[PDB]
Structures are given as structure tokens and as C-alpha cells.
Design an enzyme around this catalytic site. Structure first.
Site, PDB file in Angstrom:
ATOM      1  N   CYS A 296       1.616   3.085   5.214  1.00  0.00           N
ATOM      2  CA  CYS A 296       0.909   2.743   3.983  1.00  0.00           C
ATOM      3  C   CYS A 296       0.335   1.332   3.989  1.00  0.00           C
ATOM      4  O   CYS A 296      -0.362   0.962   3.037  1.00  0.00           O
ATOM      5  CB  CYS A 296       1.791   2.909   2.738  1.00  0.00           C
ATOM      6  SG  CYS A 296       2.311   4.608   2.412  1.00  0.00           S
TER       7      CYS A 296
ATOM      8  N   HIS B 228      -6.424   8.613  -0.701  1.00  0.00           N
ATOM      9  CA  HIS B 228      -5.401   7.785  -0.064  1.00  0.00           C
ATOM     10  C   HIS B 228      -5.230   8.144   1.407  1.00  0.00           C
ATOM     11  O   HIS B 228      -4.261   8.814   1.786  1.00  0.00           O
ATOM     12  CB  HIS B 228      -4.068   7.898  -0.806  1.00  0.00           C
ATOM     13  CG  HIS B 228      -2.961   7.114  -0.174  1.00  0.00           C
ATOM     14  ND1 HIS B 228      -3.161   5.881   0.406  1.00  0.00           N
ATOM     15  CD2 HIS B 228      -1.643   7.389  -0.030  1.00  0.00           C
ATOM     16  CE1 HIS B 228      -2.015   5.431   0.885  1.00  0.00           C
ATOM     17  NE2 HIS B 228      -1.078   6.325   0.630  1.00  0.00           N
TER      18      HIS B 228
ATOM     19  N   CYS C   6       1.653  -1.032  -2.085  1.00  0.00           N
ATOM     20  CA  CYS C   6       3.050  -0.689  -1.872  1.00  0.00           C
ATOM     21  C   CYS C   6       3.180   0.277  -0.700  1.00  0.00           C
ATOM     22  O   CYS C   6       2.308   1.113  -0.452  1.00  0.00           O
ATOM     23  CB  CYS C   6       3.660  -0.075  -3.135  1.00  0.00           C
ATOM     24  SG  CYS C   6       2.880   1.464  -3.670  1.00  0.00           S
TER      25      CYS C   6
END
Lengths: 436, 710, 436
Positions: C99, C392, C422
Site C-alpha cells: 500500500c 486503488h 495508510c
């Protein structure tokens, strides 16, 4: 201008290397059978801190890379912190650079703390050839991607109609370069055909390393940096590497058929590293922090180099390209070197390197340098044996040279050690040790 | 006010009223007669301003929902009528709360024990937090007492009798997941949303859909109830041997509650509670429970302890692993082992592996939890990393010179603030220390047979022992979930000191042609678990002799053991389970019978003639020797406190708890009458039965033992 | 300078950042279906290089990374050098960090640029959620190892004699944490339960995230960062992101079932970021190098921060923990921060973050700081919406939102923006932008 790279932080403190440790290596399908490299990494680091007896809160970052990357844990480095008693606030992430991950793992950590972001770092690498993440064919994968997204029950049977008897067969892994299709020994073989590497001298160094190898355990010097493995079955602990066969004859080496080029190749299993499993890690942490918390560093760091070259031909010459870069960054000389060491990937490539390192013409034209790097003194060249002995756990290959080098230079005066290793994809890496 | 009215009520802006449970006495939410009193005032106030959605109950305390009913007031009861009425007022109050027509919710957090379940059985809606700290349980049969107030018959009404009865007979702890699984608690919710989740359920009105039982529990009353009752009673009598009350009484009160109606169970519960409150086993258990709480609340040393974060173990093996397994799995403290042989490291690690492996084999713990627990275990063969070990324990052979060798090397190769613990069996602690740089940091930890079985250990300081060392030791054993007791540094210490006469006379009798059945049944029937001979099989005959030779050297012939039996067994190695080839062989066909006895042992032993007398004669003589020795050790005050002395014997050796411990038993036996009993046996058998000087001193004067016992 | 640290290179020149490119994000099946992650980088980088006045030889090192990993090509960046027409002597290199692979790869290039080792480089990441690797059952992995090492045919039938049960069908990948078993959204429910975030407190932020972004495509303000995807079938080129749905009303998707709890799930699929496909690459190369070859920098950099916290409770606070470090490293203030943005992976959580960002208590005790980092201004926050719209892609979302930030700051004509994201495993990052 002399392109020297002072490896000191903003405050000017140089980079210290306090200690490290290597997990003893085992062949493929040996005591390290069914043992994921994560487990091998977990046990060594937990013991290493126990052996280091330093607080875990001192360590501010750790980075772990893996060859033959495993799917379940993408960032195994964070998994180690969760797997061990390490403080969660330690900034763990994973990298991947060929077989020179260990060289890479220290480098990015070192420059980060050289920039001053952290004060203590951990680098390590491990691989396990006993365990393979073998997968299904690509066509079968797309079908399974289709079926789970399929909405109609009757659609699946038609979606499953496209099938073949060979589709169910899993694909074995390969070692040949993705963009080239040639195995590592194939590159060595043509260089052996190029520069001239007879099998007998290729086998001779294997004898020299093996005699140096078994003698090392016979001397037992490689004990304080090698752990004794303990297995959950707890049948018996392991102490020494099984690969080292230091009781061998050069004639025995010559009694093997060539592996890759079965017609003119001068490389066999005798003069080629086999698939071994193990782990290693080293603490990277600056001299100021070491002095602040009171430890003696196992040497220091002087310089390092990395190089990328053509993959089609002369793909395993990386250290030869990287060596002048490391020397120029170190501002030193091949003569200004107590010990010289390179990764013994193949006997064919190795002897060509020393030939090419002493080749004035090649450095004059391919490197453009004024002179050749120099001639490699065999006395200081791979004193403790080499890769044709211990084996190739891929990532741990970098550290295993580091440990012996620092200890050997610790066994002697301060001096300067040399550690270099070639890599697939025409990648070269070099590094220069101070060892005080 | 709210202190007395711990059930501080609050009606929210909606039609829902919340009732807190905050007794100001302590963090435990106990039940008091005043609490039973003022709740009638509150429920009457609840009757005021009717026509609301419902009411809820909250823990109002982060630790527990309710501790339960207080037993100190029960101990203040005198006869059955006080106990019968005490049940009756509890019986009526619960039904009175149950008599409400609106939805009542018990949103419970933390421990809900004792009378809270009776209250929980009253509420139509029951919800509990998801924390592991919360639990439901009826802990009173372990006290030799029945919790008769209506829940003892509502629970089998609520849930199948197959599980209700075993709950009553074996009052234990139930997970929120388990209770919801069987349906005891309506739902499980996180502690953060515990209060709110009840609100909508409380607003949800009258779920008149009682969940059906397993449909195999309908036998209560009709055919099957007696079969169940007969099977459990016979098995219980096979289990409890009948020397424990409050077992058949449960079967009676449950049957009349089930097969004769709730009111029939109600009156029996009142009546059974009355007649049983003064049963001698009851206050025996109550007093035993008192000391257990007292020792748990006891801090051991009065000096403040020191922080404990790292511990060392010298040597390895199965015995070394036992400390290692507990320290990691129970105490959760890093531990380092220093067995020179990696096999010793290999064995101890294998043992702790096997201990945890069975847990995961039961799916009791996660596989990662094992790895997390295995992380605390570290082994080596050097002193690296030992430089920061606060405590060090030796798992090495008991050679004295080696022991003084052990203290020197650990002093040389560790920290200076660190303290040392010795796991000796024979050598005195000060003798072990002898020459030591800091003998005050050397403490004696007499461990025992596999420590995970018995939680009792001996705290043995010597002439020079820092109180903080004990304080660290006392905190550690408690932090290990164990039982520390300070034992005077005397020959034989306390436990093995008093244990020697037990098997001594037993062998003396066994040498006189005693059979396995008579000697075994005599001790086990007298509330002593695991008879002597099988005890020696498991502890090991090689360890059966233990260090008893010094006992004669220290305290004369009183501990003398008969000859030509230890010789007759050491030569023909029969160690029980140490060699496996004890007189109780294993691997028998079927493996579903008692451990078989050898026929050849009787010729191997002297086996003089044939057995005589009866089990009580064997029982009375064996017991009094411990009594004669138990008073003996406390006569020189080997144990600091009488209750400490009583608790160790009743809990460690296995004295019958229903006797309340030997000090209770001698108090129960009173005075010189038992002293008079033990001279006649001395005359008819021999001088091993000489009275203790205090034993006649206390016995003749009629002196008591439990302070103001009599 | 106890908290502020300079980010200027050894030579005294600030670190320039130059124009980059984003592959238009497409859903896992709508577009980019069957497209690997490696080639996605090939087009975006190949077009990014053929977008400015820099020749290929100027670049000296390119660092990529992928959260979803393929067993082949562990260093995907090498094939980026090899597959594209690129200098074969550029330091290709790959990393892995879930991420935040984009953020870390950017940092790696920067720290390499700090010492002056590399003067011109490309940092980015590749992600494709249509080519997911599907592995076989782990039991049928050592048997494959055993049969590979099997010698006689009789042993194989003994080895294959054990196959039974459900070892046949493969093991689908799972998003749940390896050592925590949390599906990365279930931990969002509890935080919303912990901090009391209403489904209608959210689902309007999702609207304003869907809004301000469909406007951005309508305004075309984000045209300069995104190329027009070309598919090898060439059925149609794709220019606009398909995931964005900046037209549904805030009450239109609030009428949906809970996602994870299904009993108290105040978060759902609509108010959670959906997985898409894309890649990004940004030209990172210093001020002096930019100036001397004549190229304008797309802003600059002030400071950055990476932080790790315990992944057991509220682990998605990483940006909240990372933010004060980035400000203190920049020596700046939350008030003195023109425009901000968030990764906005889920409803709530960030709402808790802003709640926690302005919560004086949390920084008082959890961070020890005398004051909270402060609240946020919504107008300065997700001006162009964000991930609840575009999509995403793990390795592509990072670089994307800096590119949008700088140009919007260019539309705002200066100021200091902020970018945070995050990451799983209790990982967070913060970095402070200076658009001159």
C-alpha cells in the site's frame, strides 16, 4: 576529480558493522526440508539479538530480502517482526535485487542512516531451495480468474469446457534469464570458451577451495558466527554445512560429464555451486550509536559499487566493472588490500575475471580506464575456501563472505578486505571493507 | 445512598432504565443482604412510572459484573433455618424479579459468578462482553455447598439437563462463545458496544420464543431421568467415594425440581441448603478456601521486590524443561538455557514442544501462539546473553562442590544485581551457598514432580538471604501461578520431611505380607488420592528412596526405613515409570484396566506371613505419623503460620480436603483423645508412634490449633 | 534543527521533482483485463520518457515495486529497462511494501540521490488486479519437490499414494493479515465502533469524494498527469477513469447492506475504496541536473515521514502518527499547509483520523507531543476527491495523488501541500510537498 565517496553521516561519523551471523547451510532436501525461509530467518535473528544481548528497542529499522520470492507474505520483513519479539515500531520492508540482495539490503539501509534518518538497522537475506512455490499454467490461471467472477451457474460449465490434459500439470521453475533464456552456467560456458577455461583448472580451484573448506571446519574457525540449527522434531541439532567435501581428488572432479554443454563445456557439478538452504543477517548501526551504547564494531565500511551491463554476452563480469568503481570510491588500490574475495559462482567465470581483472586492454577499452584493475593474488584470494564448498543459498551468499572476511581481517591486522559478487541480468555489485 | 443502593438506577431519555452494580466495598461486585433489601425498594421504584420499553443491567465496573453471594454471612448462620430462610429470601427475590412482564436485560462485563447466574437466569435477555475476562460459573460445589435459589432448577429448565447437572456437580468456567453456542447467553458483543447493543434488545419487546433443548434432555421426569441420575450417582460414588456431601443432594433437588415442579425443587433447595450449610465438610472447604485467598493475597516478603524481566536456566533435560515451559507459557518471561549438551537443550525444547503441541492438537491455542510462546525459549551452551538475567536456576546434578561451582560461575558470568534460585533436593541452601559473593541473592526453590501438575513449591532462604530476593521469588511464583511457602532451612525442609514416614510404615506393613488391594484401598478411601505404591511408581522408586538416609542422620530412627526392600528393588531395577518396568507394567491387553501388579514382587519383598488388621488400622497409623510429624515440624516452626502449615499439607501432599486439613482434623479430633489413640498403637506395634512433646502438651490441655478453634 | 532536517543534497542543490505520468486506473475486469503489471509500467514509462525533453541516457536508476508479486521477474524493474527501449546500464531495481510501495520507491531514489550516486531517476510502482497469481495447495508443493527429486518410478507411486482429500483445488488469495487474520476492512468497522462514526456521518464524504472528482474529469484539470491507455487489441483507447461514479447521491448508496460485521457494519462496499488497475511513474532528478539539461521541475519536496505501529488495534492511524513527523521534519505547521489530501481507503477511519488529528488527548499520550497536530480544513482536503472514485492500485495510488497535488497547487499557484497514505500491518507515511 577523484570520485571518492565518504561514507559518513551528516555529523561525519562513519558507518559501523558491529556483528552478524549465518545460519549453517544444508543441501536441497536436507535437514532444512519443509522449512520456509521465514522460519530460518526468524530463528537466526532471535538468537542473534540473544547472542548480541543488546536491547531490541535500540534497533530502529530492519530490511530483509528474498530470492525465490514466496506468495503468502509479500513483505516477509514485517512478518519477522510480528513473528519475533521485536518491537512493532521498527519500519520493516522487503527488497529484491537478484543474488546481490545482501549487498543491496545493506546499501539502502546504510545510505538511509548515512542520511541520518535512523541510528540502528538490520539487514539480512535467506533462501530455501528445498521448498518451491510451484504454480499452475498461465492459461489455467485465467480460467480460474474467470470462474470466480462468473455470475451464472450454467456459465461455469461452459467456462470450464476449455480444458486440456497438459493444463493440469504444474509448471516447474526455471533459472535461465527471463529476457535471455540462457542458464547461468551457459553464460559461464561461453566465457570459458571465450577466454579459455579448461576443466582441469576449473576443477583445480574446486579442490583448492574444498581443502580450504574442510580445513576451516577442521580448524573450526567458522563457529562463533555460525549457529547450531534446532528443528521442531528435535531429533538432533545440526552444526556444520553438509556441502563441504574437503576430502576429494582432482581426478574425481574430472570424472563428471559436463552439465550444460555436454560436448565442450568445462563445468560440472564439481565446479558449480549446488542448491543449498540457509539464512544470514548483519546489524548495521553507526559508530556513534555503537560508542554511545558501548559496543566494539566488527570493522567498518569504506565503499561499495553496483553496475549493470549487457545480459546477452559477458553477463557475469559485473564485479570486474564494479571493482574500479568501488576502488575509486574507496580511493584505494588493489595492492592496498589485505584480502581479496569474490563470489565463486562458477570456476569458468572466476578464472576469466582474474584474467580480465589483469587484462590491460579490456579495462582500457571496455571500462575506458587508464590501466587494468590488477592481478589477483591467490594467497589472499578466497583464503577460507569459497562458494564451491559452502553452496549457494542465494541471499545469504553476500553475508557469508562478509563474516569470514571481517573475522579473517580480525584474525590479522586491520587491512582492507574486498567482497564482490556477480548477478543475473548483467548486474554487478562490489563493496570495500575497512575492518579497522 | 448509592453506596448502600449499589443498584443506582437511571432512566434514559427513552423508555429504557439502566441499573448499575457498584458496591463501594471493593472492586468485586458481591451480594449482600442489604443489596437484596434495597433492590426491593428499587424494584418498587421501578414499578413506579410503568409503561416503558424495558430495563437493563450493567457491570458498571471494569473488572466483573458480579462476584456472587458473600459466604461470611453464610458462615455466620447457625442452624438449618437460617440457611433455609436465606435460600427462601433468595428464592423469592429472584422469582419476584422474574415476575416482571417487561424485557429485563443483564448486560454483563467481566466475571459473573455465584449468585449472579441465579440473577442471570432470572433475566429474560442476557448479553455479555467479548473480552476473555468475562465468564459464567457456579463455584459452590467445590465448596461443598449447593447454590439453591431457583437457578439450580431454572438452568435445567433453561438448558438441557445433560449439561446443567454436570455444571452443578462440577461448577466451572464457561466461555461466552460456549454459552452462546449452547444458547445460555442470548448474544455476545464487544465491550465498547455492550451497553448500546442491549438498548435495542431491551426495546425489542417480549421474544416469546423459548429455544428448544437438544430434545434428548426431555427425559427429566419421564424415563431416562432415573437412568441419568443412577448413572451419575454411581459414577460420582465411584468418583467421590461418598466422603463428599452435596452430591446426592443435588440429584435429589434437581429431580424434585424437574420431575416434581419448580416449587417442589424450591422447598427442597431451601431444605437441602439448610441441612447442608453446617455439614463438617462445608466449613472445612470454606476454611480451606480462606487460606487459599489469604496466601494469594499474601505478599510473602514484606520488603518491596525488584523488577523481573530475564531469567537463566543452568542445564537442561525433562526436569529443566518443566521450569522452562512454565516460565514462557505461564510467566511469559524470557528464559535462557545453558545445557552444554545440545541434546539437553534438544530434550527440554522437545518437552515444552510436546506440552504445547497437545494444546494445539486440542485446538486450544493457535499455531502462531505456539510460535509466540516458543519465542520466549532460548537455549545455548555459553554465558553470552546471561549477563542480563535477573534470576538463574540450576537444573544440574546435586553435587555440593558442583553446586558451589555453579554459584561461582554464574556470579562470574552474569550481572551483579541478579539473584540466584537453587532447585535442590538434598543440600541445604546456606550449605549450597557456603562461599558466595552475594549469598543474600541466593534462594532455595524446592521444586517437585512435574511442576505443571502441583502448583506448590517451597521457598527456602538461609542465614543470609535478602528479603527482596524472597519478594522477587514470591512475586515470581505467583506470577508463575504457583504457591510459594517459606520453609525453614532445615533437614528435609517440610514436605519431603513429613512424607518419609508415610511410605515408611506402609513398607513395614507391606513387608508383613500385605496385598495390593488392602493397602491401596485403605489410603484412597481415606480421602488420599493416588495410593503410596502407585505414587512411588510415578515419582520413581529410584527417587522413592529420595534422600531419606540423611533423615536418620538428622532425626534418628524415626525416619528409619526397613531394610532388604530398597536393596531388593534397586538391584532388580524396578523404578515404576522411570524405567517403565515397575510393578505396574504397561502395555496390557485392552489397556482399560487398573495397573497390573507383579506376582514376583512379593517374593522379592520380604512379605512376612499374611496381611492382618483392617483398612482403618492401616489408615489410622499412617495418618498419625504425618500428624506426629506435622506437629513436629511446626513445633520448631518449620512453617511460619498454622494456616500456612495446614494449607501446604492439605494441598501439596493430598490430605483429604473434606477433613479441612490436618490442623482442622486434629482440631476436629480435638485433644488428647487422638493422643490417647496413638499410644495404644505404639504399644501393640512399636515405638515409632511416640507422641510429640507439644502433641501431649496441646492434647492433654485440650488446646486448639486454628487459633480460637476450640 | 532538533526536529527539522534539511533534505538538500550534498552539493547544496534542492531536490527537484519533475512531471510524471499515471496510467488511467481501470477496474479489475472492465479494462486492463489480463494485462500484467510489468507491461503497464512499460507503456507509462515509455510514454513518460517520450513526454519531456530528456533523453534516455540521462536516467541512471529506476526503482519500481509491486504489492501483488509474480514469481517470474522478481526485479520487475529490470524488464522495464530490458523490455522498453532504455539504457541497459540504468540501475533497475525493485522493492516491496504493501500500500506504500510508491512512497518507499520514491524515498529510495531520493536517498540514492542524497549522496549524489544518482543524478536522474524514475520512481514508481506497478499494480494489476487482473493477473493475480494462483498458487497450488501447500501440501502439493513438497510432493512436487519430492517428485522433482524422486529417483525411481517405484518411489513416485509411493509418494503419490498419499494424495487424497481436498488437496486438488488451489488456495485462493486472502486479504486477511497473515499473523492477525484481519481482512483490512473489519479493522475499519471496529475503529468506527471505537470512535463512533455514523454511516451517515460518512457516505457524504464519499459523496464529496465522488463529487469534486467527476467535476475534475469534466474540468479536465487532471489531464496532464494521465496518458490515454491503449489496449493491444485496440478495440478502443481509454482516457477517462471508469471506476469514478461522481454522480450518485449521498443517500443513493447509503441503502446498502453492511460489508464485514453484517450486524453493526457502519461501513460497506460503496463507502470503501475498490481495487483497480494502473501504474505510475514520476521523474525524480535533482535541481542542478534539471537546470543544466533545461527542464522545469514539477515542484519540489520539503520533508517526508514513515511510521510503523502495532497491528492489533487501530493500526490504520499511520498517517496520523506520520503527519507530525513530516511537519516537524519540514519545520512547518498544519495551519501553514496549503491544501491536503488523504489516501481515503475507507469511510470512517480517516474521519477518526481527523478526529484523532485534532484530538489533543491522543497526541498528548499516544505520541507524547504537547499538542495535537490539529484539525483539517475540508476545503483544503480532497479538492479533487480521491481514492473513493478513481480506484486503488496499491503501487500506483501513491505517485498518482502527488502528481494531482502539485498540478492543483500549480492551479493554486504555490503553497505547501500534504500527502499521506495508510498501509497494512500498522504502516503509515507522511510527506510534505513544496510547490515552490
Amino acid at each position: 576529480m577523484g570520485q571518492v565517496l565518504p561514507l559518513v553521516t551528516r555529523q561525519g561519523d562513519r558507518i559501523a558493522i558491529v556483528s552478524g551471523l549465518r545460519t549453517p547451510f544444508a543441501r536441497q532436501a536436507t535437514a532444512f526440508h519443509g522449512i520456509p525461509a521465514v522460519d530460518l530467518g526468524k530463528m537466526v535473528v532471535g538468537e542473534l539479538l540473544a547472542r548480541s544481548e543488546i536491547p531490541a528497542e535500540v534497533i530502529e529499522q530492519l530490511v530483509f530480502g528474498q530470492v525465490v520470492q514466496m506468495p503468502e507474505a509479500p513483505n516477509i520483513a514485517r512478518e519477522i517482526v510480528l513473528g519475533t519479539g521485536m518491537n512493532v515500531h521498527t519500519d520493516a520492508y522487503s527488497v529484491s535485487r537478484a543474488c546481490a540482495t545482501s549487498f543491496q539490503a545493506v546499501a539502502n539501509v546504510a545510505e538511509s542512516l548515512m542520511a541520518g534518518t535512523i541510528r540502528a538497522g538490520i539487514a539480512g537475506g535467506a533462501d530455501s531451495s528445498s521448498v518451491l512455490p510451484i504454480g499452475v499454467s498461465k492459461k489455467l490461471a485465467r480460467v480460474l480468474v474467470d470462474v470466480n467472477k462468473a455470475r451464472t451457474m450454467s456459465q461455469r460449465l461452459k467456462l470450464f469446457s476449455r480444458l486440456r490434459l497438459r493444463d493440469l500439470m504444474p509448471v516447474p521453475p526455471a533459472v535461465a534469464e527471463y529476457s535471455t533464456g540462457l542458464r547461468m552456467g551457459d553464460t559461464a560456458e561461453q566465457m570459458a570458451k571465450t577466454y579459455g577455461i579448461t576443466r582441469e583448472q576449473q576443477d583445480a580451484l574446486a579442490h583448492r577451495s574444498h581443502q580450504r573448506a574442510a580445513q576451516a571446519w577442521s580448524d573450526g574457525k567458522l563457529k562463533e558466527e555460525v549457529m547450531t540449527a534446532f528443528i521442531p522434531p528435535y531429533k538432533q541439532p545440526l552444526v556444520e554445512d553438509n556441502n563441504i567435501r574437503g576430502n576429494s581428488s582432482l581426478a574425481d572432479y574430472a570424472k563428471l560429464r559436463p552439465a550444460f554443454d555436454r560436448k565442450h563445456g568445462t563445468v560440472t557439478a564439481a565446479n558449480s555451486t549446488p542448491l543449498t538452504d540457509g539464512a544470514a543477517a548483519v546489524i548495521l548501526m553507526t559508530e556513534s550509536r555503537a560508542k554511545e551504547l558501548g559496543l566494539v564494531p566488527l570493522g567498518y565500511l569504506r565503499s561499495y559499487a553496483f553496475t549493470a551491463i549487457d545480459v546477452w554476452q559477458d553477463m557475469l563480469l559485473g564485479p570486474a566493472w564494479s571493482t574500479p568503481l568501488a576502488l575509486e570510491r574507496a580511493g584505494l588500490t588493489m595492492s592496498d588490500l589485505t584480502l581479496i574475495d569474490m563470489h565463486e559462482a562458477f570456476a569458468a567465470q572466476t578464472l576469466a575475471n582474474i584474467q580480465l581483472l589483469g587484462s590491460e586492454r579490456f579495462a582500457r577499452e571496455a571500462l575506458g580506464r587508464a590501466h587494468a584493475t590488477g592481478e589477483v593474488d591467490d594467497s589472499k584470494f578466497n583464503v577460507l575456501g569459497g562458494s564451491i564448498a559452502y553452496g549457494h543459498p542465494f541471499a545469504a551468499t553476500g553475508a557469508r563472505m562478509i563474516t569470514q572476511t571481517l573475522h579473517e581481517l580480525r584474525r590479522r591486522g586491520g587491512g582492507f578486505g574486498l567482497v564482490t559478487a556477480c548477478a543475473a541480468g548483467g548486474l554487478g555489485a562490489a563493496m570495500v571493507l575497512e575492518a579497522e | 445512598m448509592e453506596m448502600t443502593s449499589a443498584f443506582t438506577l437511571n432512566v434514559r431519555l427513552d423508555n429504557i432504565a439502566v441499573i448499575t452494580i457498584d458496591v463501594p466495598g471493593e472492586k468485586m461486585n458481591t451480594l449482600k443482604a442489604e443489596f437484596a433489601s434495597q433492590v426491593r425498594a428499587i424494584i418498587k421504584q421501578l414499578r413506579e412510572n410503568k409503561e416503558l420499553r424495558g430495563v437493563v443491567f450493567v457491570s458498571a465496573k471494569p473488572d466483573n459484573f458480579i462476584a456472587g453471594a458473600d459466604i461470611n454471612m453464610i458462615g455466620n448462620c447457625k442452624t438449618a433455618q437460617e440457611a433455609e430462610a436465606l435460600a427462601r429470601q433468595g428464592q423469592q427475590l429472584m422469582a419476584e424479579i422474574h415476575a416482571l412482564p417487561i424485557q429485563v436485560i443483564a448486560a454483563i462485563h467481566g466475571a459473573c459468578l455465584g449468585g449472579g447466574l441465579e440473577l442471570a437466569l432470572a433475566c429474560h435477555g442476557r448479553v455479555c462482553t467479548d473480552d476473555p475476562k468475562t465468564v459464567l460459573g457456579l463455584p459452590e460445589v467445590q465448596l461443598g455447598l449447593l447454590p439453591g435459589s431457583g437457578g439450580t432448577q431454572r438452568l435445567p429448565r433453561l438448558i438441557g439437563v445433560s449439561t446443567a447437572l454436570e455444571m452443578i456437580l462440577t461448577g466451572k468456567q464457561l466461555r461466552a462463545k460456549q454459552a452462546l453456542k449452547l444458547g445460555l447467553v442470548d448474544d455476545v458483543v464487544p465491550h465498547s458496544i455492550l451497553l448500546e447493543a442491549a438498548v435495542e434488545l431491551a426495546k425489542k419487546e417480549r421474544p416469546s420464543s423459548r429455544p428448544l433443548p437438544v430434545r434428548e434432555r426431555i427425559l427429566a421426569g419421564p424415563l431416562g431421568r432415573a437412568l441419568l441420575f443412577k448413572m451419575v450417582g454411581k459414577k460420582t460414588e465411584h468418583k467421590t467415594q461418598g466422603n463428599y456431601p452435596a452430591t446426592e443432594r443435588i440429584l435429589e433437588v434437581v429431580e424434585t425440581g424437574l420431575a416434581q415442579g419448580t416449587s417442589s425443587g424450591y422447598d427442597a433447595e431451601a431444605r437441602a441448603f439448610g441441612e447442608l450449610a453446617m455439614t463438617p465438610q462445608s466449613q472445612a472447604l470454606r476454611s480451606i478456601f480462606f487460606a487459599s485467598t489469604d496466601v494469594k493475597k499474601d505478599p510473602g516478603s514484606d520488603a518491596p521486590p525488584a523488577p523481573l524481566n530475564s531469567v537463566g536456566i543452568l542445564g537442561g533435560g525433562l526436569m529443566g524443561g518443566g521450569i522452562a515451559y512454565v516460565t514462557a507459557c505461564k510467566a511469559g518471561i524470557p528464559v535462557r538455557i545453558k545445557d552444554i549438551n545440545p541434546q539437553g537443550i534438544n530434550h527440554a525444547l522437545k518437552y515444552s514442544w510436546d506440552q504445547l503441541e497437545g494444546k494445539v492438537r486440542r485446538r486450544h491455542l493457535k499455531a502462531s501462539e505456539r510460535d509466540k510462546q516458543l519465542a520466549l525459549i532460548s537455549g545455548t551452551t555459553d554465558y553470552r546473553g546471561f549477563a542480563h538475567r535477573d534470576l538463574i536456576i540450576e537444573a544440574v546434578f546435586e553435587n555440593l562442590e558442583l553446586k558451589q561451582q555453579m554459584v561461582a560461575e554464574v556470579e562470574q558470568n552474569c550481572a551483579a544485581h541478579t539473584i540466584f534460585a537453587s532447585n535442590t533436593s538434598s543440600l541445604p541452601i546456606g550449605d549450597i551457598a557456603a562461599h558466595a559473593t552475594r549469598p543474600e541473592q541466593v534462594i532455595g526453590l524446592h521444586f517437585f514432580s512435574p511442576v505443571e501438575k502441583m502448583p506448590l513449591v517451597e521457598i527456602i532462604p538461609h542465614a543470609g538471604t535478602s528479603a527482596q530476593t524472597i519478594a522477587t521469588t514470591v512475586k515470581l511464583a505467583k506470577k508463575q501461578g504457583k504457591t510459594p511457602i517459606v520453609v525453614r532451612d532445615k533437614a528435609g525442609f517440610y514436605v519431603n520431611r513429613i512424607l518419609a514416614p508415610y511410605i515408611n510404615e506402609a513398607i513395614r506393613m507391606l513387608t508383613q505380607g500385605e496385598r495390593v488391594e488392602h493397602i491401596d484401598a485403605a489410603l484412597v478411601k481415606f480421602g488420599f488420592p493416588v495410593g503410596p505404591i502407585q505414587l512411588l511408581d510415578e515419582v520413581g522408586i529410584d527417587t522413592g528412596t529420595k534422600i531419606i538416609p540423611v533423615l536418620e542422620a538428622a532425626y534418628g530412627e524415626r525416619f528409619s526405613a526397613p531394610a532388604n526392600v530398597v536393596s531388593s528393588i534397586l538391584n532388580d531395577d524396578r523404578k515404576g515409570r522411570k524405567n517403565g518396568r515397575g510393578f505396574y507394567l504397561y502395555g496390557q491387553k485392552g489397556r482399560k484396566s487398573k495397573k497390573q501388579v507383579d506376582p514376583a514382587i512379593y517374593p522379592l519383598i520380604g512379605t512376612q506371613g499374611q496381611g492382618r488388621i483392617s483398612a482403618p488400622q492401616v489408615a489410622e497409623r499412617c495418618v498419625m505419623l504425618m500428624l506426629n510429624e506435622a506437629v513436629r515440624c511446626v513445633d520448631e516452626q518449620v512453617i511460619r503460620s498454622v494456616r500456612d502449615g495446614d494449607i501446604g499439607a492439605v494441598f501439596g501432599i493430598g490430605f483429604p480436603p473434606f477433613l479441612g486439613g490436618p490442623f482442622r482434623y486434629i482440631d476436629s479430633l480435638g485433644a488428647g483423645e487422638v493422643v490417647a489413640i496413638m499410644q495404644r498403637l505404639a504399644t501393640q506395634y512399636g515405638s515409632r508412634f511416640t507422641p510429640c512433646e507439644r502433641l501431649v502438651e496441646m492434647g492433654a490441655r485440650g488446646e486448639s490449633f486454628w487459633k480460637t478453634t476450640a
